[PDB]
Structure formats: C-alpha cells, structure tokens
C-alpha cells in the first residue's frame, strides 16, 4: 500500500486488522536497505530520540484499525512502516502486518548520472569482456537501458538490475553487456542509452 | 440442539470458557423456513448432551418464558397498610431482638418504605440498626436456626458487569421476538463486587463484640464460608441492573477473632435463566434478557444471614 | 554503547541444520532478552522467537518443532539452531534486544492483562540463502578510469552473496558508490563499486579495493592504476 | 415476498387470532349509569 503526502504536513498510515479489544500496537520504521528502527513502543508513546508529533491512535478504541499520524512529514521519513498488533482477544501475532510505503511528493527531480566502463585488460586475457554502464542520482526510479553497436542494436546479452533507492533520493542501476574479446575490437564503438523520463542520455566507448 | 464453541479469546489454559458462542436454527415468521442464527450464552445456562452439542439447562426440568424487556426489576419502597378496625403497632425500642415486651411502642397505619430486595447471603439497602449492631435469632443454641444480623453502619459495595453486550433481535414468530446476546464490544472481563476492607474490618469487629455477649466473653469466634449445595445458596445471589449475579463470598467469611486502603473484590458470575420460587406451578422458567452496556451499581450491605455449626461440646469457639 | 552483530555461514543445503551466532558488544547476555527476526524478500518481517536467562524462552508455533535457541554467557553471545531446512527459510536474520511490558486492561487479579514485547536495539543483520548449489569464488577485475574522474572495481562471478568491498582497507569513505548485483542466467551474481576521485592523482595515490567473500573465504586485494 | 408467492400482511407485525363467527359486531344502545351518591 502507498501513501502520497506533500512535505511539511500530516501523513497517515493504516496497518493491521480491526481492533477487537484493548491493544498495544508497536510501530516500526524500515529504511530502504537497513534494519527496522523503533518509533512508537506503546500505541502513542515515543522512546528517547524520536521527534514529534509522531502519534498513533489510542489503544482504547474498540472496532478501529491502527492509524499512525506523522506531523511535519519530511523526505527523510520516506520508508516502509510495519506494525505489531497486540490484541487482547487474539493469540500472539508472530508476523508483522504488511508494511506501508510512504511517498513524499515533489522530490527534487534528477538527471541520471551515467558512467560507461569498458572491459579490463586482465579480463581480456581471461577471454571475457563486459561493458558496464552504472546509473545513479536519478529520480524517480524508472529507467530503460538499450545497448547499441555503433548504430546497430544489441538484442541479447543485456543483464540489467531494477532501480533501487539508496538512503537518499539517489536510485541505482547497473547494466552489464557480455561480449568476447574479438567482438569488442570488431565494431568501432559501443553505446549505452539510458532512457529516463522522455529524455535519453547516451555514453559511448571505443577500442584502442 | 446448540452447536457451541468458545468465545473469540486467547487466554491461558486456566480459564474455562464461561461464555459460549452458540449457533442453532430458529423458526421464522412463517412456519416453514428455519433460521440459522447465533447467540452468546453463559456456561451455567447450557449443558452438554450425548463437535460439542449442548442444550439449555432447563429443557429437562420445566418450560421457559422470557421476561419482557419493558418491565424492570427495580426494588421500590412498599408501605404496608391495614384496613379500618385494625392498626399496625411499631416498637420504638432501640435495642430490641424482636421477641418480648417493647417498652416504647407507638402505632401507625402504614410501615416505612420496605424495598423488596431479593438476595440470599447478604441483605442489601436495608434498615440500619440504632447504636449497637443487632443480632436476632429464634433459638441461638439450635445450630439449625439462622442468625439474622442487622448493621448499624452500612458497608459500601460496588458490583459491575464489565462487558458491553449487544442485543440481537431475532424474529421467532409473527408476534414474538427473542433478545439474544450479540457480540461483545471490548474486553472479555468478569463481573465483580468490591467491598472496602476498612469498613468491613470495623463491621466484623463490631459484630463479634456483640457475639461475645451470648457465647461467653473469653472465647474465639471464627468465620468460614458456605458449606455447599445449590448456586443460589453458595453464592450471594441477587439482581442488579437486570442480570442475576452469583458472587463468591469466600473472601469475606474467612477470619478468626480472639477474645481481644483497598477493596476486597469478589468473583461474580452471571446467570440469565433462573427458576426461583418453584416457577409458578411446575412449568414456567424465566430468561433474563441481555442488557446492553456495562452495568455498574453501588449498594449498601445492611445485614447478614448466618448459620452456626453443630460442634455440640466441641470447643470454646 | 550497544553493538549487535549477526554472523553465520550464508549458504545451507536443504534439510540441513542452520547454526547462527550473534556477537554482542557493550552488555551482558544475562541481563537482556534476545529475539531473532527474519524477513523474506518483499515480505513482512517474521518474528522467530525470544530467549533469556533462567530458562525463559519461547518459539514460533508455526516453527515450533524445529528451532532451538541458546545463550553463551561465557563468550557473551546468542546462538540459534534451525534443523531440517527448506527453500522457505531463505531470508535476512536479525538479532535484537527485547524489552518487555505489561498492558493491564481489566483488574489484574483476574489475569485480565497480557505481556507485550518490543525490540528496540537491532543488529545489522545477516543473510541466509538456502540452495543446493556450490559456492563460487569471486573474480575481481579493476575498472580503469578536466576536474574530476571516476574509477572502480568489479566482482563478476560469485555465489551465493554477499561480498564486502572496502577501499585501501577502509581509508576512503567519501564518494564511494557500490551498486547492486545482477543475477545472470547462469546463476552467478555480479556487482561493481566506483569512487569519484580528483583527476590530480599521479601519485601513485595507491587505490587498492579489498573484497572479502565469506562463504568461499576469498579475500582479494586488487590494485587499480590507469 | 422475495410464480407469485405472498404472505399475510400481519405475519411481520403481530400474531393473529380469528374472530369467532358466533359473536356479532352489531352496535347496540348502551345507557351509562352512575352509582348512588352521584348523578
Ligand atoms: C474494584 O476494585 C478494583 C481494584 O483494583 C478496581 O480494579 C481497577 O479497575 C480500573 C478500571 O475500573 C483499572 O484501571 C486500569 O488501570 C490501568 C493501569 O493504570 C495505572 O498504571 C499505569 C501504568 O503504570 C505502569 O507504567 C508506568 C509508566 O507508564 C510506571 O511508572 C508504573 O510503575 C507502572 O509500571 C499508569 O500510567 C496509570 O496512571 C494513570 O492513571 C492515574 C490514576 O490515578 C493518573 O493519576 C495518571 O495521571 C495516569 O492518567 C495508573 O497508575 C490503566 O492502564 C487502564 O487504562 C488504560 O487502559 C484502559 C483499557 O484499555 C483504557 O480504557 C484507558 O483509556 C487507558 O488507555 C490509555 O492509557 C494507556 C496507558 O497509558 C495507553 O496505552 C492507551 O493508548 C491510552 O492512552 C492513550 O490515550 C490517552 C488519552 O489521554 C493518552 O493519555 C495516552 O498517552 C495514550 O495516547 C485502566 O484504567 C485497574 O487496572 C483495576 N485494577 C487495579 C489494580 O488498578 C475496579 O475498578 C473496582 N470496581 C469498579 C466497578 O470500579
Ligand atoms: C440499592 O440502592 C442503590 C442506590 O439507589 C441502587 O442503585 C441503583 O442502580 C440502578 C441500576 O443501575 C440505577 O438505575 C438506572 O440508572 C441509569 C442512569 O441513572 C440515572 O440517569 C438519569 C439522569 O442521568 C436519570 O433520569 C435516570 O432515571 C437514572 O436514575 C438509567 O439508565 C436506568 O434507567 C433505565 O432503566 C430503567 C429501568 O431499568 C427505565 O425505567 C429507564 O427508562 C431506563 O431505560 C433505558 O434503559 C435501556 C438501557 O439500560 C435503554 O436501552 C432503554 O431504551 C431505556 O431508555 C436506571 O434508572 C439507579 O439510578 C440506582 N439508584 C438510584 C437512586 O438512582 C441499587 O440498585 C439498590 N439495590 C438493588 C439490589 O437494586
Ligand atoms: C460467533 O460465531 C459466529 C458464527 O457465525 C460469528 O459470526 C461470523 O463471524 C465471521 C468472522 O468471524 C463474519 O465474517 C465476516 O464477514 C464480513 C462481511 O463480508 C461478507 O458479507 C458481505 C455482505 O455484507 C458479502 O457481500 C461478502 O461477499 C462477504 O461474504 C467480511 O468482510 C469479513 O472478512 C474479514 O474476515 C475474514 C475471516 O476469514 C477474512 O478472510 C477477510 O479478509 C476479512 O479480514 C468476515 O468474513 C460473519 O459475518 C459472522 N456472521 C454473521 C452472520 O455476520 C461471530 O463473529 C462469533 N462471535 C465471536 C465474538 O466470536
Ligand atoms: C495468548 O495466550 C497465551 C497463553 O496461551 C499467552 O502467552 C503466555 O504469556 C505469559 C506471559 O505472561 C507466559 O508466562 C511466562 O511463563 C514463564 C515460565 O514458562 C515465566 O517465567 C514468565 O515470568 C514472567 O512473569 C512473572 C510473573 O508474571 C514475572 O515475575 C517474571 O519476571 C516474568 O516477567 C511468564 O510468566 C506464558 O508461558 C505464555 N503461554 C504460552 C503457552 O506460551 C499470550 O500472552 C496471549 N496473547 C494475547 C495477545 O492474548
Ligand atoms: C446507604 O446507606 C446510607 C446510610 O447513611 C444512605 O444515606 C442515608 O440515608 C438515610 C435514609 O435511608 C438518611 O437518613 C434520613 O435522613 C433524614 C434527613 O432529614 C432524616 O430526617 C430521616 O429520619 C432519616 O434518618 C441519611 O441522612 C443518609 N445519609 C446521608 C449522609 O445523607 C444511602 O442512601 C443508602 N443507599 C442505598 C440504600 O442505596
Ligand atoms: C438445523 O441446523 C442443522 C445444522 O446445525 C442442519 O442440519 C442439516 O441437516 C440435514 C438433514 O437432511 C443434513 O443433510 C445436513 O448435513 C445438516 N447440516 C447442514 C445442512 O449444515 C439443519 O438442516 C437445520 N435445519 C433447517 C435448516 O431447517
Ligand atoms: C436435568 O438436567 C440436570 C443437569 O443436566 C440433571 O442433573 C444432573 O444429572 C446427571 C445425571 O442424572 C448427574 O450426573 C449430574 O450430577 C446432575 N447435575 C447436578 C448438578 O446434580 C438432572 O438429573 C436432569 N433431570 C432429568 C434428566 O430428569
Ligand atoms: C431477647 O432477649 C431477651 C433478654 O435477653 C430474652 O429473654 C430470655 O427469655 C428466655 C426464655 O424466653 C429466658 O429463659 C431468659 O431468662 C430471658 N433472658 C433474660 C435476660 O431474662 C429473649 O429470649 C430474647 N429473644 C430472642 C428471640 O433473642
Ligand atoms: C457499547 O457498544 C455500543 C454499540 O452500539 C456503543 O454504541 C455506539 O457508540 C459509538 C461510540 O461510542 C457511537 O458513535 C454510536 O452512535 C453508538 N451506537 C448507537 C446506536 O448510538 C456504545 O458506545 C458502547 N459502550 C460505550 C460505553 O461506549
Ligand atoms: C464504590 O463506588 C463509589 C462510587 O462509584 C465510590 O465512591 C467514589 O469513588 C470514586 C472513585 O473510586 C472517588 O473518586 C470518589 O471520591 C468516591 N466518593 C465517595 C463519596 O466515596 C466508593 O469509594 C466505592 N467503594 C468501593 C469499596 O468500591
Ligand atoms: C470455602 O473455602 C474452602 C477452603 O478454601 C473451599 O474449599 C475448597 O473448594 C474447592 C472447590 O470445591 C476444592 O477444589 C478444594 O479442594 C476445597 N478445599 C478444601 C480444603 O476442602 C470452598 O470451596 C469454599 N466455599 C465456596 C462456596 O467456595
Ligand atoms: C470460591 O473461592 C474459593 C477460594 O478461592 C475457590 O476455591 C478455589 O478453587 C480453585 C479451583 O478452581 C483452586 O485452584 C483454589 O486453590 C481454591 N482456593 C482455595 C483457597 O483453596 C472456589 O472455587 C470459588 N468458587 C466456588 C464456586 O467455590
Ligand atoms: C484466609 O485468607 C487468607 C488470605 O488469602 C489465606 O492466606 C493464604 O494462605 C496460603 C496458604 O496456603 C498462602 O499461600 C497465601 O499466600 C495466603 N494469602 C495471603 C493473602 O496471605 C488463608 O489461607 C485463608 N484461610 C485458610 C484456612 O486457608
Ligand atoms: C412489515 O411489512 C410491511 C409491509 O409488508 C412493511 O412495510 C413496508 O416496508 C417496505 C420495506 O421496509 C417498504 O418498502 C414499504 O414502503 C412499506 N410499506 C408501507 C405501506 O409503508 C414493514 O416495513 C414490515 N416490517 C418489518 C419487516 O419489520
Ligand atoms: C475452550 O477453551 C479451553 C481452554 O482454553 C480448551 O481446553 C477447550 O478445548 C476449548 N473448547 C472449544 C470448543 O474451543
Ligand atoms: C432451643 O435450643 C435448646 C438447646 O438445648 C433446645 O433444648 C430446645 O428444644 C430448642 N427449642 C426451644 C427452646 O424452643
Ligand atoms: C481486620 O480484619 C482482619 C481479619 O482477621 C484482622 O486480622 C485485623 O486485625 C482487622 N483489623 C483491625 C484493625 O482489627
Ligand atoms: C465482657 O466483659 C466486658 C468488659 O470487658 C463487659 O462489659 C461485658 O458485660 C462482658 N460480657 C459478658 C460477660 O458477656
């Protein structure tokens, strides 16, 4: 589930089944690629280090779902959010609720920083070749890579990762193209075209 | 035939399912199509018979009729009057054990407001005694004769039903309609009754000081709970907000008095199908309809109905 | 300060016995509750179970008859065992401290309460992949490079994951960008690590990337030069 | 209530009893009287 809210406002996240008795929901924050961190440890009680007004719905209402209000929403709070429901009528939940991803709107926007590396000499001596274009600092994470052999398209051999944010607005993507030592020297030059948001950045490399 | 299960709750194994989520058929307005409807009953109301299949406890003793929800069971003050040519004489003595001459008698036409409170072990909202607490008995030596105690100061008691019940309005016939207990809104909690242990302290001390006037002065007086039998006798059977409570009085009468700030809470059970007073013939049984919301009631303990054991020449106590 | 570290093999064959250890630093294991939490890829973290001194320990009813936890007081660490593994156990296992609490809703005496636990101080976590394939050592190849410049290293052929890459034995933490691996059709991952450096580095300002792959105990120090 | 199938209009409001055919509904003259001491 996804929640879109502008920065400097109030966000609201729903998690878990409907309440049946007196509950003590525990909230967790999962930063992308990190370990979950504690935010609320007793259904609207923050420990030391968590700012206000991070609030949850009181655990005395019967018949509602756990809602998490986040006032003054920032881009740094953009992360997944899980919940541990502690309902007096239900057995112990050994599985956290399905997390809710927060989307903070009006992110800067970023032209992709592409970098094309040719194959190393020690790899050519090993009868291998791999072109690598590494793409970073692009937003949002939605890019499509296309390889070219000096105006000839490359169909197969392309292995590409899926966009992946990295503790920032920076997404990451690595595109590898596997070739043989003769294929590199054959064509005049090779190009990696990254199509990002209507625009297309190309970077080329030529043999020596 | 009721196909019953436990109520939706995860608690330890030391909690017998007082409440049972039951399902059964019912006749609708028409005498053709049935009705797979569910209700919630207390364990005391039902009994298994050989998936757990039960029945109502009274199906094998007597018929049953529901108490209309329009009527109430609120004890109101009743003044009893006599007709012309008659009069009601009222003893005006402060210390009077009910039997014998009364020095200061007056007369009246109608007694004071006597609330008909139905309880068994503890008298409630009664008339306080004057000055010293009062003991009354037909034959103190006979251990088979009850000993009625009337209090001078009232002991505050608080009984509550912490369950926000729901009323299901089933249509059993073209005119009749049954009020089942729907789902519980909130926590699975038990009915209980509170007694301030300080006031109860002093009250028990003041009754034992009056007992020593009849059983010798330097003797030891012990209090134990009921012996056993029916629930109506072994528990402080009564009605409060409409539900009929049955409380365990083992924490009040477990003491021992020699010659010389919290509340005592009591586990109170509730029953809806009661058959007191034989049932008006050998047939009728009453179903106390389910009551919406949490019931809380504050009453006075104004007297006791005690009984002594037949030790004969057993002890000084 | 409280530092938690999870450490294990990383690759376990099906129907075997996983064994993990959580190195704890800054506090004793006798004075804290310790819980283990795995999380499959793209799933919600699954609570495994908790352990403490004096024999107070509990597991997951779904994983009841397979797990065994322990505490080493002498060596000050936590221990986990999971017998008879299958493909469902592949996940990222975290070691965290646990704090207890009671919420009372009724009157206490009626046992009208329940204890709720919450983990506050997590560990960095360890990865565990269940596969019947063998471990493959990585193959390190340096990626050769006015104003600024780029320069990188490449790990092309390894299994199962992960491979920790430092620069100059950890003396370069500014401008480093490590990119996520890609699973190739042969079943071998491949990642790359770049550093943005000033063009003025004739030096030679030695750049030596240190790769370590624990499942194959492969440690390769690759010197890159234009 | 949902071949047209019906019910009686009152099955869903109240029970029902038939008026015996022996009794009649004929309005007869009633003279109202008061007791002694009244007029
Ligand atoms: C017959 O006699 C018996 C004899 O016992 C009676 O039985 C009693 O009956 C009552 C109810 O009738 C029960 O009340 C419950 O009490 C518990 C416990 O409360 C006490 O303990 C709390 C915690 O103490 C522990 O933690 C603290 C640290 O927090 C620690 O320092 C301490 O050492 C200990 O380890 C105290 O916080 C609490 O203080 C509160 O009350 C004081 C009253 O004197 C007041 O002075 C304080 O300022 C403070 O306000 C007290 O000492 C309660 O937890 C419980 O209330 C919660 O749960 C119920 C049921 O779910 C719910 O309806 C309430 O709304 C309340 O839930 C709020 O509080 C939770 C805890 O903070 C929180 O998690 C919830 O989310 C919710 O709070 C949220 O919203 C509020 C909205 O303002 C906000 O403030 C919060 O920050 C949060 O956002 C019950 O009231 C008794 O337990 C029971 N037995 C005993 C032994 O007491 C019986 O009643 C008698 N018969 C009859 C008919 O009455
Ligand atoms: C020993 O002595 C004590 C002290 O008197 C006595 O306590 C009494 O307890 C009863 C039971 O709880 C109390 O009676 C109820 O009071 C509540 C609310 O209190 C008052 O609220 C308003 C003003 O706030 C008053 O106008 C009102 O009259 C109450 O006094 C009421 O909600 C109850 O009324 C309902 O039930 C009555 C009969 O049961 C109906 O006549 C009345 O119309 C109400 O019906 C409603 O109830 C349904 C929900 O329950 C609702 O769904 C229906 O639609 C309907 O609208 C009731 O009056 C009483 O106040 C306490 N004493 C005094 C002096 O007030 C002990 O009971 C006594 N010992 C024993 C064994 O009884
Ligand atoms: C005492 O025992 C009785 C036995 O009948 C219980 O009554 C049933 O309880 C269940 C749940 O416990 C109820 O089922 C719920 O129904 C909801 C309504 O959806 C249906 O109704 C609409 C029309 O209103 C239809 O169009 C629709 O297609 C559905 O058929 C559902 O939304 C609920 O879904 C939730 O729970 C299920 C549980 O499996 C999940 O799978 C869902 O994802 C979701 O979380 C649920 O299915 C049922 O309605 C109750 N009966 C009646 C007549 O209402 C009592 O609950 C029980 N009481 C206690 C206290 O234990
Ligand atoms: C759902 O119901 C289950 C019961 O099936 C319930 O789990 C139970 O939780 C209690 C926690 O209070 C467990 O009791 C523990 O037992 C161990 C020994 O086995 C004790 O050492 C523990 O001691 C604690 O409590 C003492 C007094 O309360 C303290 O003095 C001490 O310092 C410890 O804090 C503890 O009592 C019990 O074993 C489980 N039951 C099972 C079967 O595991 C669960 O809480 C319920 N959950 C919900 C949401 O309703
Ligand atoms: C529980 O018991 C107390 C007893 O103190 C009840 O309050 C008291 O009620 C009595 C009457 O039942 C009051 O006595 C009367 O007072 C008038 C005052 O003019 C007096 O003229 C009468 O002769 C009679 O003695 C008494 O004043 C009152 N106490 C206080 C402090 O107000 C209480 O109502 C009882 N609760 C119940 C039965 O639910
Ligand atoms: C009353 O309820 C019971 C179940 O609680 C129903 O029992 C069914 O009886 C028929 C008899 O022919 C069996 O074939 C079914 O297997 C029983 N179970 C069902 C249908 O779930 C019974 O039908 C109900 N009475 C009605 C609906 O009139
Ligand atoms: C009516 O039902 C009650 C309860 O179901 C019966 O009382 C029980 O009877 C059984 C067998 O006769 C005994 O084992 C139990 O000990 C009895 N219970 C108690 C509390 O004494 C009663 O016998 C039934 N009456 C009939 C069938 O005529
Ligand atoms: C009420 O108290 C009086 C006085 O204690 C009791 O009177 C006793 O009556 C018996 C026989 O009826 C005599 O043998 C005693 O001598 C009387 N006592 C005194 C002191 O003279 C009376 O029995 C008591 N009644 C009740 C019901 O307790
Ligand atoms: C017990 O449950 C009933 C269920 O109807 C509650 O009544 C509802 O309460 C909510 C919030 O308290 C109101 O918004 C609804 O309007 C109420 N229903 C009706 C029909 O009016 C009741 O409040 C619960 N008990 C308590 C003490 O809150
Ligand atoms: C019984 O109930 C009454 C009223 O519910 C209690 O009296 C009040 O209790 C509240 C909360 O406990 C106090 O804040 C008030 O000051 C009390 N007022 C008076 C006049 O007492 C009473 O204490 C309860 N007693 C017991 C034994 O449960
Ligand atoms: C009065 O107190 C006695 C002693 O605490 C209770 O006796 C116990 O009753 C339970 C329930 O039947 C038995 O399991 C125990 O074995 C009994 N103990 C002894 C020593 O006999 C008795 O139940 C209490 N009275 C009531 C009515 O609850
Ligand atoms: C009334 O109170 C007595 C005393 O607490 C209860 O007897 C207890 O019964 C349980 C079994 O459910 C035992 O575990 C306790 O040890 C008993 N108490 C004592 C002091 O021995 C009794 O069960 C309660 N209820 C009834 C109906 O007697
Ligand atoms: C009368 O009540 C007291 C109060 O609970 C009982 O005292 C308990 O005795 C047992 C002995 O088996 C102890 O383990 C408990 O700790 C005592 N409780 C308290 C609160 O002190 C006493 O047992 C009861 N009377 C009898 C004869 O059992
Ligand atoms: C009892 O039956 C009557 C008539 O069948 C119902 O009155 C009709 O109700 C329906 C639906 O509620 C409305 O669409 C009609 O407009 C009503 N008729 C008139 C003349 O107003 C009545 O609601 C039923 N009562 C129940 C089912 O409780
Ligand atoms: C009800 O609960 C008790 C204890 O929790 C259990 O032993 C029993 O089997 C349960 N019965 C049903 C029908 O669920
Ligand atoms: C009262 O108890 C005594 C005790 O011995 C007994 O003899 C007598 O028959 C009982 N009945 C009375 C006094 O009416
Ligand atoms: C209160 O009652 C208990 C029960 O026996 C007794 O031990 C205590 O002495 C009493 N309190 C006072 C002040 O007499
Ligand atoms: C008991 O002794 C007291 C004095 O301590 C005395 O007032 C009382 O009358 C005596 N009661 C008897 C002997 O029954």
């Amino acid at each position: 589930t996804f929640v879109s809210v502008a920065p400097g406002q109030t966000a609201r996240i729903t998690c878990g089944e409907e309440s049946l008795g007196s509950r003590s929901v525990i909230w967790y924050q999962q930063r992308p690629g990190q370990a979950p961190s504690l935010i609320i440890y007793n259904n609207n009680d923050r420990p030391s280090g968590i700012p206000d007004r991070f609030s949850g719905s009181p655990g005395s209402t019967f018949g509602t779902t756990a809602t998490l209000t986040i006032t003054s929403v920032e881009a740094g709070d953009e992360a997944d959010y899980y919940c541990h429901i502690w309902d007096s009528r239900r057995p112990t939940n050994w599985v956290f609720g399905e997390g809710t991803t927060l989307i903070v709107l009006s992110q800067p926007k970023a032209a992709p920083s592409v970098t094309l590396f040719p194959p190393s000499s020690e790899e050519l001596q090993a009868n291998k070749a791999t072109l690598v274009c590494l793409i970073s600092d692009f937003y949002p994470g939605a890019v499509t890579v296309a390889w070219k052999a000096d105006s000839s398209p490359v169909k197969a051999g392309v292995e590409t990762t899926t966009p992946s944010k990295q503790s920032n607005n920076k997404y990451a993507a690595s595109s590898y193209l596997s070739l043989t030592p003769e294929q590199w020297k054959s064509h005049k030059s090779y190009s990696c075209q990254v199509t990002h948001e209507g625009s297309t950045v190309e970077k080329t490399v030529a043999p020596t | 035939t009721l196909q019953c299960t436990n109520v939706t709750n995860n608690i330890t194994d030391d909690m017998r399912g007082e409440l049972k989520n039951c399902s059964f058929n019912m006749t609708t307005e028409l005498r053709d199509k049935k009705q797979k409807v569910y209700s919630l009953f207390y364990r005391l109301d039902v009994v298994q018979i050989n998936n757990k299949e039960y029945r109502l406890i009274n199906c094998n003793t007597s018929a049953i009729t529901q108490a209309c929800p329009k009527v109430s069971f609120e004890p109101i003050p009743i003044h009893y009057c006599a007709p012309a040519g008659f009069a009601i004489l009222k003893c005006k003595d402060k210390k009077f054990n009910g039997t014998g001459p009364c020095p200061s008698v007056s007369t009246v036409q109608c007694t004071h407001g006597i609330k008909p409170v139905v309880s068994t072990q503890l008298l409630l909202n009664g008339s306080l005694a004057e000055e010293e607490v009062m003991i009354r008995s037909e034959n103190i030596t006979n251990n088979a004769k009850n000993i009625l105690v009337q209090f001078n100061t009232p002991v505050q008691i608080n009984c509550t039903r912490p369950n926000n019940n729901t009323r299901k309005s089933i249509r059993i016939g073209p005119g009749q309609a049954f009020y089942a207990t729907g789902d519980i809104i909130g926590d699975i909690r038990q009915a209980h009754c509170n007694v301030s242990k300080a006031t109860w302290n002093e009250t028990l001390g003041k009754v034992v000081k009056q007992l020593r006037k009849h059983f010798g002065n330097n003797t030891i007086i012990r209090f134990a709970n009921s012996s056993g039998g029916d629930l109506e006798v072994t528990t402080h059977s009564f009605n409060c907000g409409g539900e009929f409570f049955y409380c365990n009085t083992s924490g009040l009468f477990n003491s021992t008095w020699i010659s010389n700030n919290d509340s005592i809470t009591l586990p109170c059970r509730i029953k809806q199908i009661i058959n007191m007073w034989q049932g008006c013939g050998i047939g009728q049984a009453m179903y106390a309809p389910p009551i919406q919301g949490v019931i809380r009631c504050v009453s006075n303990i104004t007297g006791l109905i005690l009984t002594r054991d037949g030790g004969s020449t057993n002890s000084t106590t | 300060q409280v530092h938690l570290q999870e450490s294990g093999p990383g690759l376990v064959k099906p129907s075997e016995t996983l064994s993990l250890t959580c190195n704890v630093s800054g506090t004793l294991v006798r004075d804290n509750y310790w819980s283990w939490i795995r999380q499959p890829l793209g799933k919600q973290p699954e609570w495994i179970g908790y352990v403490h001194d004096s024999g107070d320990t509990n597991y997951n009813p779904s994983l009841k008859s397979r797990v065994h936890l322990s505490l080493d007081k002498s060596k000050n660490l936590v221990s986990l065992r999971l017998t008879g593994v299958t493909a469902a156990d592949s996940a990222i296992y975290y070691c965290a401290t646990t704090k207890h609490g009671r919420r009372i809703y009724g009157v206490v005496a009626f046992k009208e309460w329940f204890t709720y636990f919450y983990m506050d101080v997590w560990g960095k976590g360890t990865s565990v992949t269940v596969s019947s394939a063998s471990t493959k050592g990585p193959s390190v190849f340096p990626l050769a490079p006015g104003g600024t410049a780029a320069l990188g290293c490449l790990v092309k052929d390894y299994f199962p994951e992960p491979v920790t890459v430092s620069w100059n034995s950890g003396a370069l933490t500014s401008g480093v960008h490590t990119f996520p691996a890609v699973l190739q059709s042969s079943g071998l991952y491949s990642l790359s690590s770049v550093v943005t450096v000033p063009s003025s580095s004739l030096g030679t300002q030695t750049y030596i990337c240190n790769v370590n792959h624990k499942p194959s105990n492969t440690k390769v120090d690759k010197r890159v030069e234009p």
Side-chain angles (χ1 to χ4, degrees), chain B residues 32-103:
Chain B
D32 293 330
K33 314 157 190 188
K34 284 220 170 181
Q35 185 181 12
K36 182 83 181 186
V37 63
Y38 78 95
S39 170
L40 299 188
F41 298 101
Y42 304 77
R43 194 191 272 289
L44 301 164
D45 311 323
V46 288
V47 285
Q48 193 179 357
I49 190 71
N50 268 354
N51 63 299
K52 284 183 165 192
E53 59 223 335
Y54 292 88
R55 64 162 157 89
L56 268 60
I57 181 71
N58 74 92
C59 308
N60 79 305
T61 70
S62 65
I64 176 166
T65 291
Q66 173 183 61
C68 292
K70 301 103 196 179
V71 295
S72 170
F73 311 95
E74 62 199 62
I76 42 180
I78 299 177
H79 308 254
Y80 251 76
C81 314
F86 302 76
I88 299 172
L89 310 184
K90 164 172 203 169
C91 178
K92 205 65 148 293
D93 191 11
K94 317 307 186 180
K95 305 179 194 176
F96 184 59
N97 59 350
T99 309
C102 174

Side-chain angles (χ1 to χ4, degrees), chain B residues 12 72 85 96 109 126 160 162 168 174 215 226 234 237 242 247 282 302 312:
Chain B
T12 59
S72 170
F96 184 59
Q109 179 63 225
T160 183
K168 305 277 287 184
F215 304 99
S226 179
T234 48
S237 323
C247 300
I282 328 179
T302 311
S312 182

Side-chain angles (χ1 to χ4, degrees), chain B residues 6-313:
Chain B
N6 285 338
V7 70
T8 313
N9 189 13
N10 159 87
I11 200 61
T12 59
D13 263 326
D14 195 343
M15 306 286 299
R16 285 173 191 174
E18 184 188 17
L19 302 158
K20 292 283 187 172
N21 184 342
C22 299
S23 309
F24 52 90
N25 291 313
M26 193 49 54
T27 61
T28 62
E29 295 175 9
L30 303 85
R31 188 166 176 182
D32 293 330
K33 314 157 190 188
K34 284 220 170 181
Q35 185 181 12
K36 182 83 181 186
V37 63
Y38 78 95
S39 170
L40 299 188
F41 298 101
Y42 304 77
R43 194 191 272 289
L44 301 164
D45 311 323
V46 288
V47 285
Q48 193 179 357
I49 190 71
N50 268 354
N51 63 299
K52 284 183 165 192
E53 59 223 335
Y54 292 88
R55 64 162 157 89
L56 268 60
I57 181 71
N58 74 92
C59 308
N60 79 305
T61 70
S62 65
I64 176 166
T65 291
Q66 173 183 61
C68 292
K70 301 103 196 179
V71 295
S72 170
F73 311 95
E74 62 199 62
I76 42 180
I78 299 177
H79 308 254
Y80 251 76
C81 314
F86 302 76
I88 299 172
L89 310 184
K90 164 172 203 169
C91 178
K92 205 65 148 293
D93 191 11
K94 317 307 186 180
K95 305 179 194 176
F96 184 59
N97 59 350
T99 309
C102 174
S104 53
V105 180
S106 47
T107 203
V108 74
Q109 179 63 225
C110 307
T111 70
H112 78 267
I114 291 177
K115 290 179 290 297
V117 292
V118 178
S119 52
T120 57
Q121 294 172 323
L122 288 76
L123 313 171
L124 304 182
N125 294 7
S127 293
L128 297 164
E130 301 154 285
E131 302 197 9
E132 298 190 23
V133 182
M134 216 63 60
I135 308 167
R136 297 181 179 83
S137 170
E138 196 185 65
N139 201 18
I140 282 179
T141 307
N142 196 335
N143 47 287
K145 300 303 182 184
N146 286 343
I147 298 163
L148 282 56
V149 174
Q150 185 166 343
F151 294 153
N152 169 19
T153 47
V155 180
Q156 199 73 342
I157 175 173
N158 287 329
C159 296
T160 183
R161 193 274 291 265
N163 294 321
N164 186 20
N165 280 30
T166 300
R167 175 174 287 188
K168 305 277 287 184
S169 310
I170 302 171
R171 295 222 60 156
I172 309 183
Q176 284 63 30
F178 165 61
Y179 302 102
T181 322
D183 75 314
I184 297 295
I185 295 106
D187 291 326
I188 308 304
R189 287 178 51 174
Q190 233 161 313
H192 64 255
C193 293
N194 287 7
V195 177
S196 174
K197 63 192 184 186
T199 40
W200 183 255
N201 218 206
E202 49 187 306
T203 294
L204 264 177
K206 189 161 44 165
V207 303
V208 70
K209 297 292 185 288
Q210 297 300 137
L211 291 172
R212 59 176 183 183
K213 277 181 179 174
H214 312 70
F215 304 99
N217 237 10
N218 191 355
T219 50
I220 299 160
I221 301 87
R222 174 148 210 282
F223 293 107
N225 67 31
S226 179
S227 299
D230 291 352
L231 188 75
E232 185 179 326
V233 63
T234 48
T235 56
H236 166 50
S237 323
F238 74 88
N239 174 294
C240 146
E243 288 285 355
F244 294 85
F245 294 57
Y246 295 72
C247 300
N248 209 16
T249 65
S250 302
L252 298 176
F253 303 142
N254 160 44
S255 293
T256 170
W257 293 92
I258 310 302
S259 184
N260 56 343
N261 298 131
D262 201 69
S263 307
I264 304 160
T265 68
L266 299 173
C268 293
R269 331 171 79 169
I270 295 176
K271 187 162 64 182
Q272 290 176 315
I273 292 162
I274 57 180
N275 283 350
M276 23 169 115
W277 306 351
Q278 203 56 50
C280 309
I282 328 179
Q284 245 55 195
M286 97 178 294
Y287 183 91
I291 317 180
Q292 319 87 340
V294 170
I295 304 301
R296 200 213 59 178
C297 29
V298 185
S299 295
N300 281 330
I301 311 167
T302 311
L304 319 168
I305 305 176
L306 310 187
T307 294
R308 59 184 302 251
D309 307 48
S312 182
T313 317

